[PDB]
C-alpha cells in the first residue's frame, strides 16, 4: 500500500510487483467486504508493477 | 582491449571459388586464434582453433594460418552452405574479442 | 559434448535490470570458463564476460563492467547475466557459451541465443 486514505472516494493506492507468464490483461478483485476496487481488470508486461 | 581487425568486410563470391579473409590483432596473440561461421537466424559455429586446427565435423576446405598479430582463414573452394558471415576472435591479453566479421554473399 | 540453453526471450523496461539464466545439459560447470556474448541483429558479436568455472572469477567487458552481474548457480548446473540500467541500446541477441577460454576446449558450445527486447 503506497498510500492509503481512509475515505468513502477510492482513496488507497496498492502497488502489486508481478511476474506474468505471458503480457495481456486479467482481472482484480478482493474476496472480502473490507477493501472496493475502483478497476475491474489491470493490463500487464511480463514482469513489472501495476 | 585486443582490437581484431577482420578484411575484407564483404566479399561476393561464387560456388567453386578460393576465398581468403584476413585477421589483424593490435598487438601479438601467438596462435591463439578462433574462427567462427554465423547464419541470419542462427549462432555462430566453431570452424577452426588455435589458428590453424580444424573443428571436428568441419569440412577439410576450411583451413587456418598465421601467428602474431596476422592470421587467414582459407574456404580453398566456396560450397552454396558456405555463404555466411565469419568472425576471427582471440582469447588473449584482457579481453578475448571478435573481429567485426566478413559477410560473404553469393555474386 | 556440452549442450547450452538461454532462458526464453521478451521484454525490459529501460532503466531496469535484463536477467538472463543459461543452463547446461549433459556436462558439469566444474570446469572452464562460462561466458554471455551478445549481438545486436543485423549487427557483430560483443563479448559481455565470462566466470571461471573452477574458481568462480569474473571478468567483464570495460564497456559494460558498471552494469553487468554475472553467477554461477552449483545447484541447477547454470549460469546468469544481470545488465542494470538497460536502455534500447542493449536490444540484441544474447548467446552463452564457454567463452574467454578453457583448459581443454572453450566456446566449442554456443547457446543458440534469446531475443532481448528493450521497450517501454
Request: proline share 3%; with cysteine; glycine share 10%.
Given at each position: 500500500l503506497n498510500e492509503c486514505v481512509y475515505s468513502s472516494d477510492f482513496?488507497?493506492?496498492?502497488?502489486?510487483?508481478?511476474?506474468?507468464?505471458?503480457?495481456?490483461?486479467?482481472?482484480?478483485?478482493?474476496?472480502?467486504?473490507?477493501?472496493?476496487?475502483?478497476?475491474?481488470?489491470?493490463?500487464l508486461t511480463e514482469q513489472g508493477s501495476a | 582491449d585486443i582490437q581484431m581487425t577482420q578484411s575484407p568486410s564483404?566479399?561476393?563470391?561464387?560456388?567453386?571459388?578460393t576465398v581468403t579473409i584476413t585477421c589483424r590483432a593490435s598487438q601479438s596473440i601467438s596462435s591463439w586464434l578462433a574462427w567462427y561461421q554465423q547464419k541470419p537466424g542462427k549462432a555462430p559455429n566453431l570452424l577452426i582453433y588455435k589458428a590453424s586446427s580444424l573443428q571436428t565435423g568441419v569440412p577439410s576446405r576450411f583451413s587456418g594460418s598465421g601467428?602474431?598479430?596476422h592470421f587467414t582463414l582459407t574456404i580453398s573452394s566456396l560450397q552454396s552452405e558456405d555463404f555466411a558471415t565469419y568472425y576471427c576472435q582471440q582469447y588473449i591479453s584482457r579481453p578475448w574479442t571478435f573481429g567485426q566479421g566478413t559477410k560473404v554473399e553469393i555474386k | 559434448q556440452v549442450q547450452l540453453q538461454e532462458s526464453g526471450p521478451?521484454?525490459?523496461?529501460?532503466?531496469?535490470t535484463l536477467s538472463l539464466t543459461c543452463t547446461v545439459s549433459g556436462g558439469s560447470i566444474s570446469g572452464y570458463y562460462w561466458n554471455w556474448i551478445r549481438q545486436s541483429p543485423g549487427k557483430g558479436?560483443?563479448?559481455?564476460?565470462?566466470?571461471?568455472?573452477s574458481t568462480g572469477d569474473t571478468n567483464y567487458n570495460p564497456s559494460l563492467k558498471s552494469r553487468v552481474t554475472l553467477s554461477i548457480?552449483?545447484?541447477?548446473?547454470?549460469?546468469?547475466?544481470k545488465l542494470n540500467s538497460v536502455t534500447a541500446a542493449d536490444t540484441a541477441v544474447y548467446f552463452c557459451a564457454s567463452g574467454s577460454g578453457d583448459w581443454f576446449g572453450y566456446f566449442y558450445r554456443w547457446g543458440q541465443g534469446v531475443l532481448v527486447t528493450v521497450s517501454s
Open positions: 482513496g488507497g493506492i496498492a502497488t502489486v510487483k508481478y511476474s506474468a507468464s505471458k503480457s495481456g490483461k486479467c482481472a482484480v478483485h478482493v474476496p472480502s467486504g473490507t477493501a472496493t476496487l475502483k478497476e475491474a481488470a489491470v493490463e | 564483404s566479399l561476393s563470391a561464387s560456388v567453386g571459388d601467428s602474431e598479430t | 521478451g521484454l525490459v523496461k529501460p532503466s531496469e558479436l560483443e563479448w559481455i564476460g565470462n566466470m571461471y568455472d548457480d552449483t545447484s541447477k548446473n547454470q549460469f546468469s547475466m
